[PDB]
Structures are given as structure tokens and as C-alpha cells.
Design an enzyme around this catalytic site. Structure first.
Site, mmCIF file in Angstrom:
data_model
loop_
_atom_site.group_PDB
_atom_site.id
_atom_site.type_symbol
_atom_site.label_atom_id
_atom_site.label_comp_id
_atom_site.label_asym_id
_atom_site.label_seq_id
_atom_site.Cartn_x
_atom_site.Cartn_y
_atom_site.Cartn_z
ATOM 1 N N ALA A 11 -29.700 41.512 31.485
ATOM 2 C CA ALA A 11 -29.546 40.098 31.222
ATOM 3 C C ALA A 11 -30.303 39.286 32.255
ATOM 4 C CB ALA A 11 -28.071 39.736 31.233
ATOM 5 N N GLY A 12 -31.571 39.624 32.476
ATOM 6 C CA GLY A 12 -32.421 38.869 33.394
ATOM 7 C C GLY A 12 -33.020 37.664 32.692
ATOM 8 N N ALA A 13 -34.167 37.201 33.185
ATOM 9 C CA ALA A 13 -34.853 36.039 32.614
ATOM 10 C C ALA A 13 -35.031 36.170 31.097
ATOM 11 C CB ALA A 13 -36.200 35.841 33.294
ATOM 12 N N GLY A 15 -33.872 38.745 28.957
ATOM 13 C CA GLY A 15 -32.659 39.153 28.258
ATOM 14 C C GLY A 15 -31.734 37.979 28.043
ATOM 15 N N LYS A 189 -50.553 48.039 29.790
ATOM 16 C CA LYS A 189 -49.930 47.321 30.898
ATOM 17 C C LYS A 189 -49.631 48.253 32.069
ATOM 18 C CE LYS A 189 -47.863 43.766 32.996
ATOM 19 N NZ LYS A 189 -48.543 42.525 33.498
ATOM 20 N N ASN A 193 -50.912 48.260 35.981
ATOM 21 C CA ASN A 193 -49.948 48.288 37.080
ATOM 22 C C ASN A 193 -50.189 49.478 38.006
ATOM 23 O OD1 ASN A 193 -47.653 46.835 34.843
ATOM 24 N ND2 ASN A 193 -48.266 45.861 36.753
ATOM 25 N N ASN A 197 -50.780 47.644 41.418
ATOM 26 C CA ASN A 197 -49.574 47.788 42.261
ATOM 27 C C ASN A 197 -49.784 48.824 43.324
ATOM 28 O OD1 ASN A 197 -46.965 46.326 41.810
ATOM 29 N ND2 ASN A 197 -47.288 47.028 39.702
ATOM 30 N N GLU A 274 -41.274 51.686 41.827
ATOM 31 C CA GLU A 274 -41.269 52.342 40.510
ATOM 32 C C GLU A 274 -42.408 53.356 40.346
ATOM 33 O OE1 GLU A 274 -41.313 49.201 37.533
ATOM 34 O OE2 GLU A 274 -39.197 48.796 38.102
#
Lengths: 312, 312
Positions: A11-13, A15, A189, A193, A197, A274
Site C-alpha cells: 500500500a505504497g504510493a 498501491g 526496466k 536498473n 543502479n 535488491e
């Protein structure tokens, strides 16, 4: 009939944003997260959604910590970053007895494989999204512009009601389209990354500085030729050249020239990265598929080493 | 008859030390170096050699900058680090018309190949040494204990007077022995350096810290398995396991646990590193011999990138 009972695991930005538009369209939605201040903020004073205009829309929502859900859903939309996913699905183990649709919209090539161990793979639907959202604070998100969604069942032949699924989302104004090209775009994507990253973290530089390197092309090519060889083995569409262009587009200061990407920040703040779900994951698949991946295996080792040195 | 006319290209700690024992044994020796304060110090006040006892032995010597030598020698002993070698042999081009013995006693696997472009390879004699020497300052070195030398012509069949060469050195008390195992030992030392110099520089850690890494064995193995595969192709004796033991022996604080190796220091002081003559060189040979070296090729790229970022 387009009603479904819906959970948002992550339930982040995004979600939180998807939770609201799906609720306002009559669906029964539960938001699931581990961040106490977030979950508590919503149960006590509603989720706030600051729109185009700096106007605060307080929305009444249902939020819960994962371990404290005994309800069952027709659909679960996962926004959990790959790394937290196993834990998040571990903790939700009971709720999946009913065998609902699992709609992973997070980022990460490791998601399907990770999800396969918790549910039947015929229930899995991968997706991408250009809907945006900021997380301003607990029970607080900021939104601008619009977006859309693109979906693709893992196993297209065994999956029921992709049309109903799309109807449900589009009923909430989310612009879902069926597509055969979603896993490709996830890999794209992750190609970006796994270069930006990883190398930025290894060099303690930002994206512009990587861009200014005499040998950025070779460093990039080395990572991507291996992705290519593995994508091919796995029969997923992939173009090293295309990802390289996407990578190049970040360099300018107007775009991301002065940005330190998420992995660099993780390292700086002594958070595990990650990496096992970026270069680490391409290497692992590579070995399953008998595709050599020595460069991505090595970069994965270098980053773990860096982690261990920072924690001291 | 054991008299030779002798040049020391690389009049550092070792070259200077060898220059003296060879002079005191009646040979005519010239010391060659680029460090102005060094060369000038010796022409004006002699080379000083502080012995076991803290006793200052001032010795009268002949020193010159490379470009300012027109003399010719029966033997040239190179102590030039591989990286400076090409320049040092470029600048000495005239003096080698006579085709003297070239006795490389520097470190680096790239030496023979580098030397082959300046003289006939039948004149080349590689060597190792456990004679030690400190460079205290200009025209000043410190010495302790003893040592020995081990020699091996590149092409044993075409080389004249290895016995006379050894006699000449041993006449100066240097303990030279013919051996068939010298190039192997150079490769051993370069296996150690290509792990400890490279990774310590990449991680900004010292040798103990590398040693404490959960994955030091895999990082080491990755570099060394490639050395092994290339050594095999090049028909040079090499044991990854043996080098690993030598590498492990450095970790303790009593040994090198708190030492930052030469490459780390080079990077810290914005000096170009010897990377092209360590992992860089194994990769290049690898390709000549059709032995894959992706890990050493990559680490080489990572270090160059690091250089470029520090210079900013």
C-alpha cells in the site's frame, strides 16, 4: 458484476493510489502494508490524496498489517518490491487458500518465479503501469496527470476472465489493456536498473558521472549482452540496443544527471540492496538455462562485498 | 673475465642495491633513473647504503638520466615496473644496438612481451629475487639480511653464457642460480597482486578487511581460475590453490592485515594504476590464446572507470 473483493499488498504510493480509484468505483478494498505509521494513519483519519490542485482529498479507507488479515479476496494486487515479496507472501499464506488472481504490478524479473512457490502459476498476471504517485508521508500521497495499465497472464491458455479483470480496473478509470509484451517491458526496466543502479553504487557516482565515463558503453554492453543471451534462452523479447538508448536518456542533468539511484542510497544508508533480484537474478536464470553470465555473477558478488564493508 | 659493463635501468631500492655490490666486485656500473633528486644526489655526494648496523656507507657511483646515456653495456638489468618500461626502453633505444643481455628483474607478467618489441627475445633473461632494500630518499637506501636470485632465459636453447652471467653476479655475492621455474613465480606474484591490489582498490578497504569478507574465496577463485586457464594455455606452471594460500597468509594484522596495497595508494593519490599489467594483461593474453577471461576483463574496466572518477 464488475465488483470484485480486492487486496493491495504493498500500500505504497501506487498501491494506495490504485486502492482509492478502485474503492471510489464501488469495489471493496483493503490496503496491506507493514509501515505502522501508514496503516494507523488511514484507520484513524483516512487516506489523503493531494491532487493536481494542491487540494487535500481525505478518503475513508480500510488498512491492516499483513499478519492481521483473515479475509479472502477475488483479486490481490501485489506492489511489493521483489525483495520483500517472499516475506509478504509468507505472511499472507492463509488468505490464498481460495486461489485468487495474483496481479503483480511491482518491478523485478524475479517476481513470477518468487510467486510460483506460493500459488498456482495459472493465477498469475504480470503488469506494467505509467500511472504515477508520490508518497508524501503516512496516509498521505500526491497525484498528478493520468496513466494506464498493460496486462499479460503468465500462462494465457489456463487463465479465466482477463476480460472481467480488465473491466473491473477500467470501471475504476485505470485504463487496463491486454498485451503480449509486458514481461518484455519488465525485463527492459531491469536491464536499465542492473546497469545504472549497480555501477553507480560500485563507483559511488551519480548517473551523469557514469554517463561521462570513457568506457560507459563497454560497461553497459557487458551487462546487457548477458541479459540478451538469457532473454533469448527464456524466449522473452529483449533488445540490448533499445535499453542502451533508455539508459543514455537518463544522463542529462535535466533528466537524472544528478540523481543517485535507489541502490546507491540503500548502500549509503546501510540497507540491503535488491542486487540478488537484478544482476543476481539474471545470473541465476542464466545458469538454469545454461547461458554463461560471469559478469553479472561477479557484479553481484562485488555489491554484496560492499554491503558487508559498510555495516562495519 | 667475470667483468662485464653493466647498466641498471631502474635505480630504485633494488637496482641501487644491486648496483653497489656489482661495483664493489670490480664491474663498471651506471645507474639509470628519471628521478632528478636521486640521480643528482649520487653524482654530487655518492650513494649512501645504511646497513644492518645503522651505519652510513657512502659509495662513489655513476648516475644518469636515460636520455643522457650514449654508452653501451654487456648487460642491462631492468628494474623498471612494467608500466614505465616501454618509455624507459623507448628512451634507451640507441644503447641496445650492440644487442646486450637484458635481465628483467622487475615484477609483471607483461614484461617479456613488452621487451620483445625492443630487442631479440633470445637475449631476454627473466628473474626473481628475495634480496630486499628500502628506498629512504634520494641517493639513500637501507639494507638488511641477505638474499638470492633465480634466472631463466626466455628461449633457453639460443642463449649464450648463462654460466658467465651467473658467475658475474655471484662474483658480486648475489647468489644467482639457474632455474626453470622463474616465469611461474612471476605469475604467482601477479596472481596475488591481481586479487589483493584490484579488489582492495575497488572496495576502498585494506587486506584484512578483504580477508574478513564472507565471499573472499569466490572473489579470489573467480580471478584465479582465469589465470589458471590462461597459464595452462600458455604452458606456464600455475596453481590457483597455492596462490590462494599465499593470499590468505597476508590477512593477519601481524603480516598485512592493516596494509593498503600499492594500487589502492595509486588511486588515492591520483596516480595511474598498473591494472593493464595485472588483470588487464591476463585478459589480453587470454584473448590471444582463446581462453575466456570475462571477469578479469571486467575488473580491468571497473578500475579504469574508478581512475577517471577520482581525477575530477
Amino acid at each position: 458484476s464488475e465488483f470484485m473483493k480486492i487486496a493491495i499488498a504493498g500500500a505504497g504510493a501506487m498501491g494506495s493510489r490504485f486502492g482509492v480509484k478502485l474503492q471510489e468505483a464501488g469495489n471493496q478494498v483493503t490496503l496491506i502494508d507493514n509501515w505502522s505509521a501508514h496503516v494507523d494513519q488511514i484507520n484513524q483519519a483516512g487516506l489523503t490524496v493531494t491532487t493536481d490542485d494542491g487540494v487535500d482529498h481525505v478518503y475513508t479507507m480500510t488498512a491492516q498489517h499483513p499478519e492481521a488479515v483473515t479475509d479472502q479476496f477475488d483479486l490481490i494486487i501485489l506492489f511489493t518490491k521483489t525483495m520483500q515479496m517472499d516475506a509478504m507472501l509468507q505472511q499472507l499464506a492463509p488468505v490464498l487458500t481460495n486461489h485468487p488472481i495474483v496481479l503483480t504490478l511491482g518491478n523485478g524479473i524475479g517476481n513470477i518465479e518468487t510467486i510460483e512457490r506460493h500459488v498456482p502459476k495459472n493465477q498469475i498476471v504480470v503488469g506494467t503501469t505509467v500511472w504515477s504517485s508520490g508518497l508524501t508521508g503516512p496516509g498521505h500521497i500526491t497525484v498528478t496527470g493520468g496513466g494506464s495499465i498493460s496486462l499479460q497472464a503468465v500462462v494465457p491458455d489456463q487463465f479465466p476472465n482477463l476480460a472481467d479483470l480488465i473491466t473491473t480496473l477500467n470501471a475504476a478509470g485505470l485504463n487496463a489493456s491486454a498485451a503480449d509484451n509486458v514481461l518484455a517491458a519488465i525485463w527492459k526496466k531491469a536491464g536499465l536498473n542492473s546497469v545504472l543502479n549497480t555501477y553507480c553504487t560500485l563507483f559511488d557516482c551519480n548517473i551523469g558521472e557514469f554517463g561521462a565515463l570513457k568506457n560507459w558503453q563497454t560497461l553497459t554492453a557487458t551487462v546487457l549482452d548477458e541479459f540478451q543471451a538469457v532473454a533469448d534462452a527464456a524466449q522473452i523479447q529483449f533488445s540490448a540496443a533499445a535499453v542502451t538508448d533508455l539508459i543514455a536518456a537518463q544522463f542529462p542533468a535535466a533528466v537524472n544527471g544528478n540523481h543517485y539511484p535507489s541502490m546507491h542510497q540503500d548502500m549509503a544508508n546501510q540497507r540491503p540492496t535488491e542486487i540478488d533480484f537484478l544482476n543476481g537474478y539474471v545470473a541465476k536464470l542464466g545458469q538454469q538455462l545454461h547461458v554463461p553470465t560471469p559478469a553479472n555473477a561477479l557484479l553481484t558478488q562485488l555489491i554484496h562485498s560492499q554491503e558487508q564493508l559498510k555495516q562495519i
